[PDB]
Amino acid sequence: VGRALPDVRDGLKPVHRRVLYAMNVLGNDWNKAYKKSARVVGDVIGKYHPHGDSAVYDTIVRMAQPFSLRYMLVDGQGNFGSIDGDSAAAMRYTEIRLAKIAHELMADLEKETVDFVDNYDGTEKIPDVMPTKIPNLLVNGSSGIAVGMATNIPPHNLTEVINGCLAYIDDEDISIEGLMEHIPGPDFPTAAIINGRRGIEEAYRTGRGKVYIRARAEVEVETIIVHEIPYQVNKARLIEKIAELVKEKRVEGISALRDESDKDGMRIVIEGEVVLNNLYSQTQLQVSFGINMVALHHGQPKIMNLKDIIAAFVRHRREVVTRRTIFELRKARDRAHILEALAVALANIDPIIELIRHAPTPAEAKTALVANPWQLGNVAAMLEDAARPEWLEPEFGVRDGLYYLTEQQAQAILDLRLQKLTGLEHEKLLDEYKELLDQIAELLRILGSADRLMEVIREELELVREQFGDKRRTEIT
Amino acid sequence: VGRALPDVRDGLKPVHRRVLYAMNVLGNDWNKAYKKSARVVGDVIGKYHPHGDSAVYDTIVRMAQPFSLRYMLVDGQGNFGSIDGDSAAAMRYTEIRLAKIAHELMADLEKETVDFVDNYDGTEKIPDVMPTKIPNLLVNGSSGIAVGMATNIPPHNLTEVINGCLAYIDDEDISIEGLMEHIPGPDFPTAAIINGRRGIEEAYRTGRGKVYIRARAEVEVETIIVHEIPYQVNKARLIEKIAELVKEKRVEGISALRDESDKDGMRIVIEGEVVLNNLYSQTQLQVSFGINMVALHHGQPKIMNLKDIIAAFVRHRREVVTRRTIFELRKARDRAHILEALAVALANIDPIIELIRHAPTPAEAKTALVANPWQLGNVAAMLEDAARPEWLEPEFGVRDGLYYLTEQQAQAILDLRLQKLTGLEHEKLLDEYKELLDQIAELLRILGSADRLMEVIREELELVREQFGDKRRTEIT
């Protein structure tokens, strides 16, 4: 039910999420060295997706192929296959790492921005979705033909989808037409041209619509050379298709067929223009694409339109940013709280040390520390509120020129390393504290203003379009 | 070459070692909770044996089956198959953990007792062999029919093999006959009886010898009921063998055939004694076992005899214990060294703290600590040698009533946690120090005496026979 359909929010299925999540836990970053695919697969089979290494590896592979993804999620190094059906190399040879943009899908995963469900054995947690900043469903697409739960969302240009997102934000009552002012149609990683423009306008407007993808080919004088073919077509099975058609003479009349596709480009050489047109009608040089935009929305299958899909992303970015803000705020209080005790501890080290050196056990030193309030040394002007945790009891913290330690704050002091008593290490705790105060006020400034919150989302999208946005590939006629 | 043959020392192949090693790294202990097989398999596929999950799982499975191993290496919980060819459950359902005795195979693995080779990607190390205290080759056996590199070593009774080992130790010039005084023959986990006693005496004496394993069966008055069959036979394929023989009338004359094998025991019911004897000669109720004792010795294939195999174990236990002793000794010096600085640091905390609280950075506090010798407080009688590391330079340590700190010892002091300044935490470092002195002298006492070293090995073997030795299964006529 859920394995078949992708989640509108992140555009992935359980597998994809598991694969990428595992890579994230492995510190398998784009800035770090590559890792053997085996390392990741085995980590996934044993912790998230225990369903045969072959399946998982095929997932890792497809996310690495430049002809499968408009914006690859996995940076693969080695034989990951080709447009001619070439199967990838073994997992113990290929090397991979999270693509630059994949980190954007799991950006803030840590900051309690998404819900986490249990894995097969209940020992590990896995995000329900990814706190993505990238509109992955549209951008990379999603296919599948299951029990009534089929989908067929084509890829799109990030720059275009972002502008579409921004537009929606600037005016919620925007039409599908105004939306198409930025997103004219799909954008395939390989494919060259889409003729039927109305199929797009229909697909976007209602979620469904057949479109036609054709190969970018031309004649030269005598010879028809195809530079780029339709999305998802096997170049090999196309040369062969043409071959067994020229043999049976189905295709009027062809001379010699030769695949001169090198590394720099592609060359499907076939030896006037009447040959090319009659070829399109009988070969894979032109393919239909029944756009079926079905995905998991609110934990339920839905035929969503362009706007529905964009609206779904933006609302996710709303939740994420908010949940991130709430976290950063709590994290901020908790640290400033630990810093207060530490600052206080170091302002009266001599009486602190005296208590410790005479207390037999650490537990006893812990009791003596919280047993009586402490004098605020030079930190009197620093502590003089909102930096205190919403869970802290009022009997703790600075009450009347004296500091009342919690049982925890005492342990922090007790865990203090001698080196932290030096001049430098001391300031770092005081400076950090002062930074937090500026930071919490900012996060509150954000949580309060529903405008400042949306302005945070906007800036993120404009940032992704800059560092990740690229040129359009598929041409629309 | 090496995949085909087992290593005389531990009796495992690269796979087995990898599987068990991974379990060890996973803390997948017998005293801890079970883990899903998937967890272990995936850990092995990604770090040690990246050759398909199916293969690895089959390994984990075979080491769990009571009918496959005389002393199981893996404690499996679930459907791990049966004597009727029943395949094990999926890896995501079965639960496993290192068997009590498996820890004995990897006992002291940590103490630099064995060499470590690189894995497929050079990111992980794997032991060349296991620092086993169990004569695994003989005890659990090893089969394989490869390119001229075939082997067929049957299982044995631990108690018996241990006594054999002890005997060898007590008199190196012991004969194969004197050895057979303890190890009369193989001991199968399932199998019931071995007739040909000379085949054993021949196999042990030269490494090769055919033996005959028969089923323990009897008649009842009319019906022949087999309680236990030969080692490695599929009970199902045996019932069927008999069936298609009574059908073709190959087997004189049989009434009804019924497999009443429940959970408590086994019942191959077939409905005088002439039936049973004629059955043995034409069925699997009796099987030959061409004992071929070939294993990896000194990194080379060898047809070893009983003694050669036992001698190989004992010599391994010699190396291991020695290498363990050398490690424990170096570890001991290094700790006492760190303790000396800590003891000295706490005997003059006030001048230590003063230096730290005034030194801006930890690096500067580090320079000031090693810049000048320190007074030995109450620790003057404790430090007053062999506890000093064989690598330490003579310009460090107590030289003339003053202590010269190393750059390291200073960092230890700097990393000291405030809680360590209490009364209790202080003694623990002083007591630990005093214990080490007794310990190093003991380890030296061991390294010096070639008798005390062998006496350590003996005691280990007698210990394994007690806690792991059990009764004999296969009967020898």
DSSP string covering B169-210: HH-TT--HHHHTTT--S---SS--EE--SHHHHHHHHHSEEE
How were these coordinates obtained?
X-ray
- What phi and psi values does residue A135 have, to the nearest 5 degrees? -75, 65
Interface probe, candidates B422, B426, B428, chain A, greatest A C-beta count within 10 A: B422
**Contact between residue A336 and residue A398 where contact means Cβ atoms under 8 Å apart:** no
- Helix, strand, coil % over all residues of chain A, rounded to 5: 45, 15, 40
**Contact between residue B96 and residue B37 where contact means Cβ atoms under 8 Å apart:** yes
Interface of A with B in 91-110 (CB under 8 A): 91-92
Tokens of A449: 């203003």
B151: enclosing H helix or E strand:
strand B151-153
Q: How are beta strands A397-398 and A475-476 bridged, if at all?
A: unpaired
**What's the residue count for chain B?**
477
Q: Do A40 and B46 count as a contact with CB atoms less than 8 A apart?
A: yes
User: In which residue ranges of chain B is CATH 1.10.268.10 found?
Assistant: 329-448
Q: Rounded CA gap, A182 and A167, in Å?
A: 9
Which residues of chain A have a CB within 8 Å of the CB of B44? 42
Q: Which of A274, A283, A197, A187 is nearest to A233 (CA)?
A: A283
Mapped onto helix, strand or coil, the DSSP state of residue A397 is strand
Q: Which of B110, B102, B112, B90 is nearest to B16 (CA)?
A: B102
Q: Rounded CA gap, A401 and A404, in Å?
A: 10
Interface probe, candidates A124, A421, A427, chain B, greatest B C-beta count within 10 A: A421
Considering only the beta carbons, identify the residue of B45, B418, B419 that sits closest to A42. B45
Distance from CA of A120 to the nearest CA of B (A): 8
User: In which residue ranges of chain A is CATH 3.30.1360.40 found?
Assistant: 207-292
**Contact between residue A142 and residue A134 where contact means Cβ atoms under 8 Å apart:** no
Tokens of B245: 């023989």
Q: Rounded CA gap, B267 and B256, in Å?
A: 14
- A386 in contact with chain B, both atoms CB, cutoff 8 A: no
- Which residues make Cβ contacts (< 8 Å) with residue B145, sequence separation at least 6? none
Regarding the domain delimited by A207-292, which CATH topology (the fold level of the hierarchy) does it fall under? Gyrase A; domain 2 (3.30.1360)
Q: Which DSSP symbol is given to B418?
A: G
What is the number of other CB atoms lying within 10 angstroms of the CB of residue A88?
Answer: 21
Q: Which residues of A are catalytic?
A: 93
CB burial of residue B218 (10 Å; 0-12, 13-18, 19+): exposed
- A418 in contact with chain B, both atoms CB, cutoff 8 A: yes
Considering only the beta carbons, identify the residue of A90, A360, A421 that sits closest to B353. A421
- B281 in contact with chain A, both atoms CB, cutoff 8 A: no
Task: Report the sign of the C-alpha dihedral through residues A159, A165, A170, A173, in that order.
Answer: positive
- A197 in contact with chain B, both atoms CB, cutoff 8 A: no
**What's the residue count for chain A?**
477
Mapped onto helix, strand or coil, the DSSP state of residue B402 is strand
CA B415 to chain centre: 38
Q: Please give the order of strands across the beta sheet that includes B95-98.
A: B35-36, B95-98, B74-77
Q: Rounded CA gap, B163 and B166, in Å?
A: 5
What chain A residue is nearest to B346 in terms of C-alpha separation? A357
Distance from CA of B32 to the nearest CA of A (A): 14
**Contact between residue A205 and residue A306 where contact means Cβ atoms under 8 Å apart:** yes
What chain B residue is nearest to A47 in terms of C-alpha separation? B39
CATH classification code of A329-448:
1.10.268.10
What chain A residue is nearest to B421 in terms of C-alpha separation? A357
Q: Do A353 and B421 count as a contact with CB atoms less than 8 A apart?
A: yes
Which residues of chain B have a CB within 8 Å of the CB of A45? 38, 41-42, 45, 53
Interface of B with A in 72-91 (CB under 8 A): 90-91
CB burial of residue B78 (10 Å; 0-12, 13-18, 19+): middle
Distance from CA of A345 to the nearest CA of B (A): 11
Q: Rounded CA gap, B350 and A418, in Å?
A: 12
Query: Where does residue A148 fall: left (phi above 0), alpha (psi -120 to 50 degrees), or beta otherwise?
Result: left
Considering only the beta carbons, identify the residue of B121, B360, B418 that sits closest to A416. B418
Q: Rounded CA gap, B302 and B149, in Å?
A: 10
Considering only the beta carbons, identify the residue of A356, A418, A422 that sits closest to B360. A422
CB contact burial A115-125 (16+ within 10 A = b; e otherwise): eeeebbbeebe
Which residue in the block uniquely carries the two structure tokens 């799909």? A186
CB contact burial A340-371 (16+ within 10 A = b; e otherwise): bbbbbbbbbbeebbebbbebeebebbbeebbe
What is the number of other CB atoms lying within 10 angstroms of the CB of residue B407?
Answer: 11
State how far the alpha carbon of B107 is from the alpha carbons of B31, B132, B391, B466, in Å.
Answer: 15, 6, 28, 17
- A116 in contact with chain B, both atoms CB, cutoff 8 A: no
- Which residues make Cβ contacts (< 8 Å) with residue B249, sequence separation at least 6? none
Considering only the beta carbons, identify the residue of A90, A121, A356 that sits closest to B419. A356
Q: Rounded CA gap, A19 and A16, in Å?
A: 5
User: In which residue ranges of chain B is CATH 3.90.199.10 found?
Assistant: 1-206+293-328+449-477
Q: Which of B15, B309, B11, B294 is nearest to B152 (CA)?
A: B294
Regarding the domain delimited by A1-206+293-328+449-477, which CATH topology (the fold level of the hierarchy) does it fall under? Topoisomerase II; domain 5 (3.90.199)
State how far the alpha carbon of B330 is from the alpha carbons of B318, B436, B441, in Å.
Answer: 19, 11, 12
**Contact between residue B20 and residue B65 where contact means Cβ atoms under 8 Å apart:** no
Mapped onto helix, strand or coil, the DSSP state of residue B226 is strand
- A351 in contact with chain B, both atoms CB, cutoff 8 A: no
- A415 in contact with chain B, both atoms CB, cutoff 8 A: yes
- Which residues make Cβ contacts (< 8 Å) with residue A249, sequence separation at least 6? none
Q: Which DSSP symbol is given to A223?
A: E
What chain B residue is nearest to A37 in terms of C-alpha separation? B46
Q: Rounded CA gap, B112 and A348, in Å?
A: 47
- A122 in contact with chain B, both atoms CB, cutoff 8 A: no
Tokens of B70: 């005389």
Tokens of A425: 């290490």
Strand-pairing partners, residue A219, are A224
Query: Where does residue A471 fall: left (phi above 0), alpha (psi -120 to 50 degrees), or beta otherwise?
Result: beta
Interface probe, candidates B118, B358, B419, B424, chain A, greatest A C-beta count within 10 A: B419
Q: Rounded CA gap, A88 and A57, in Å?
A: 9
**Contact between residue B130 and residue B114 where contact means Cβ atoms under 8 Å apart:** yes
Considering only the beta carbons, identify the residue of B46, B123, B419 that sits closest to A415. B419
- At CA B392, angle to CA B391 and CA B393, rounded to 5? 115
Which residue in the block uniquely carries the two structure tokens 């921004």? A166
**Contact between residue A201 and residue A185 where contact means Cβ atoms under 8 Å apart:** no
Q: Which of A461, A477, A474, A471 is nearest to A104 (CA)?
A: A461
- At CA A260, angle to CA A254 and CA A266, rounded to 5? 105
Interface of A with B in 295-334 (CB under 8 A): none
State how far the alpha carbon of B446 is from the alpha carbons of B328, B334, B439, in Å.
Answer: 11, 19, 11
Q: Which DSSP symbol is given to A418?
A: G
Which residues of chain B have a CB within 8 Å of the CB of A360? 422-424
Considering only the beta carbons, identify the residue of A40, A52, A361 that sits closest to B422. A361
CB burial of residue B428 (10 Å; 0-12, 13-18, 19+): exposed
Tokens of A463: 């940032």
Tokens of A336: 């400033």
Mapped onto helix, strand or coil, the DSSP state of residue B2 is coil
Q: Do B418 and A414 count as a contact with CB atoms less than 8 A apart?
A: yes
**Contact between residue B95 and residue B36 where contact means Cβ atoms under 8 Å apart:** yes
Of chain B, the end-to-end C-alpha distance in Å amounts to: 37
Which residue in the block uniquely carries the two structure tokens 């339709």? A230
State how far the alpha carbon of A410 is from the alpha carbons of A106, A204, A398, A423, in Å.
Answer: 36, 60, 15, 22
What is the number of other CB atoms lying within 10 angstroms of the CB of residue B194?
Answer: 25
**Contact between residue A106 and residue A131 where contact means Cβ atoms under 8 Å apart:** yes
**Contact between residue A460 and residue A104 where contact means Cβ atoms under 8 Å apart:** no
Return the axis-axis angle of helices B450-468 and B158-170, rounded to nearest 10°: 160
SS3 annotation, A120-159: CCCCCEEECCCCCCCCHHHHHCEEECCCCCCEEECCCCHH
**Contact between residue A123 and residue B28 where contact means Cβ atoms under 8 Å apart:** no
- B50 in contact with chain A, both atoms CB, cutoff 8 A: yes
Radius of gyration, CA atoms only, chain A: 29
**Contact between residue B188 and residue B212 where contact means Cβ atoms under 8 Å apart:** no
Distance from CA of A123 to the nearest CA of B (A): 9
- What phi and psi values does residue A428 have, to the nearest 5 degrees? -55, -30
State how far the alpha carbon of B310 is from the alpha carbons of B17, B164, B305, B360, in Å.
Answer: 20, 8, 9, 63
Q: Rounded CA gap, A397 and A395, in Å?
A: 7
Mapped onto helix, strand or coil, the DSSP state of residue B11 is coil
Query: Where does residue A216 fall: left (phi above 0), alpha (psi -120 to 50 degrees), or beta otherwise?
Result: beta
**Contact between residue A224 and residue A270 where contact means Cβ atoms under 8 Å apart:** yes
- A43 in contact with chain B, both atoms CB, cutoff 8 A: yes
Q: Which DSSP symbol is given to A417?
A: B
**Contact between residue B163 and residue B466 where contact means Cβ atoms under 8 Å apart:** no
- Helix, strand, coil % over all residues of chain B, rounded to 5: 45, 15, 40
Which residues of chain B have a CB within 8 Å of the CB of A425? 361-362
CB contact burial B363-381 (16+ within 10 A = b; e otherwise): ebbbeebbeeebebeebee
